[PDB]
């Protein structure tokens, strides 16, 4: 009798608002431009990234930041709703310049990071690797979708096998076909990677605090 | 149960269908969020294929009217002595100053590029800019 | 009156620079591994330059130095490849230290 009311007031309520967590304010097109959110040379272009490329400036693909903004809005919204729902978020990246930064960001927001060599079967053979009662991640955010031989990170395919939604920064040489919420943007410049980490860390932190505030209000009201 | 056929449809289409059939007893946590705020493109696996024959990419080269001025300036004078500071968003280079003066003199109504280019250089020289020609 | 992305691109410092070949720019040493100096000049990728012998001691993390850009990204396509090989690095020549 009480569970349905609890679920409606808490779990279903946020899903009725377009921007419940107000992630719009976290970024603007100007802020993305100032972080060099600049693609690879035209010869490195992936065919599936052409819809997101504004053009080539002297053989350097320029990502259209007007699409990035709409894609990032959806990605940050989805991430917040999953953090609000107490979902396990796993950050995956094989760029070794940013492994330390990404591992700190995960620990700071109370989530998980996998910046190391991805061993075969981490997701599709987890019950054997971790244990029969292990819980897999509910969301996987790829800050870099390519491995260190410029090929798609194996976890992208494996996440889809396990029906785990994926958020991913997809540069002009990346394949976004299996990434659920692709965000076209530069994944090389530190300024860009530092912005993504700030944006996803803030959205997760905000969502978790909102869950505590909403639960607290529901409980205080329930008693009286 | 789940379906590991990542190349057949999307995670939502597969999940939705299995929940409808009753294979999945409980829909996953993300299902409700996905449905409420879906992405612009459904994530369906598609194979990249090589363009053959006359097929070409639609990406177009980014050009501007002032690139013609910049090319001429760089040929006549070369790279300015002032080093480009790309960290400052409002940084203006000697070439950019030339383009601006060139454009300002275009508003005056000069119709000859060569005459207009000469007039542009003279105005900069009067303002104290150092314009050492390659010659 | 919101600035469009195209407006930002047209007036961006990198656009007005145009071709990067033989363009003198100012970088910042953000990371140092032995003699190897990793310099950021505002492009997509950094440029790696060997510590100059004349005044190596001066080059420290954060020092601003003058570069001559050669290429923004070192890429090439070798026999039998479907896409360019990329070094994920810029080609530049370290001229000296910037002094105001």
């Amino acid at each position: 009798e009480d569970s349905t009311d609890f679920n409606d007031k808490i779990l279903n309520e946020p899903l009725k608002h377009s921007d419940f967590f107000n992630v719009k304010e976290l970024f603007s097109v100007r802020s993305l431009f100032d972080a060099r959110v600049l693609g690879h040379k035209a010869g490195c272009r992936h065919r599936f990234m052409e819809p997101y490329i504004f053009g080539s400036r002297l053989d350097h693909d320029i990502i259209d930041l007007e699409q990035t903004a709409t894609h990032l809005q959806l990605a940050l919204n989805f991430t917040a709703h999953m953090a609000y729902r107490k979902g396990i978020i796993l950050f995956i990246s094989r760029n070794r310049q940013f492994s330390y930064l990404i591992e700190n960001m995960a620990r700071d927001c109370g989530e998980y990071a996998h910046t190391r060599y991805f061993r075969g079967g981490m997701l599709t053979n987890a019950r054997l690797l971790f244990g029969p009662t292990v819980r897999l991640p509910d969301l996987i955010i790829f800050l870099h979708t390519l491995n260190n031989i410029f090929e798609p990170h194996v976890a992208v395919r494996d996440a889809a096998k396990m029906n785990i939604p994926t958020v991913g920064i997809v540069d002009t040489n990346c394949n976004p076909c299996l990434i659920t919420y692709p965000v076209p943007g530069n994944d090389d410049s530190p300024l860009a990677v530092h912005l993504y980490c700030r944006l996803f860390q803030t959205a997760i932190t905000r969502a978790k605090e909102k869950r505590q505030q909403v639960e607290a209000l529901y409980r205080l009201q329930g008693q009286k | 149960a789940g379906s590991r056929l990542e190349t057949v449809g999307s995670i939502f289409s597969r999940t939705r269908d299995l929940v409808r059939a009753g294979v999945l007893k409980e829909k996953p946590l993300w299902f409700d969020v996905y449905d409420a705020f879906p992405p612009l493109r459904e994530p369906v696996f598609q194979r990249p294929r090589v363009r053959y024959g006359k097929a070409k990419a639609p990406i177009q080269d980014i050009w501007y009217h002032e690139d013609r001025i910049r090319a001429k300036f760089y040929s006549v004078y070369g790279s300015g002595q002032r080093a480009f500071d790309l960290f400052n968003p409002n940084f203006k280079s000697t070439c950019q100053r030339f383009v601006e003066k060139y454009t300002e003199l275009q508003k005056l109504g000069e119709t000859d590029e060569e005459k207009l280019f000469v007039e542009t250089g003279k105005a900069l020289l009067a303002e104290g800019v150092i314009l050492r020609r390659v010659g | 009156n919101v600035e469009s992305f195209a407006s930002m691109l047209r007036h961006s410092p990198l656009t007005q620079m145009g071709p990067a070949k033989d363009k003198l720019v100012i970088g910042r040493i953000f990371h140092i591994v032995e003699n190897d100096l990793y310099i950021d000049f505002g492009g997509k990728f950094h440029c790696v330059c060997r510590r100059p012998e004349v005044d190596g001691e001066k080059y420290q993390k954060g020092t601003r130095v003058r570069l001559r850009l050669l290429d923004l990204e070192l890429t090439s396509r070798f026999l039998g490849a479907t896409t360019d090989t990329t070094v994920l690095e810029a080609n530049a020549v370290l001229l000296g230290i910037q002094e105001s």
Binding site: G55, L58 | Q60, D61, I62, W63, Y64, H65, D67, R68, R70, A71, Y74 | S4, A6, S7, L9, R10, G18, P19
Partner: peptide
């Protein structure tokens, strides 16, 4: 509409084609 959109031109920075030392000499 907007005037800042890229226009279609032939590469203005394109360098001239190289020539062999004997180009144009009998």
């Amino acid at each position: 509409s907007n005037e800042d959109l890229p226009i279609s031109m032939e590469n203005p920075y394109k360098e001239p084609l190289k020539k062999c030392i004997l180009c144009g000499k009998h």
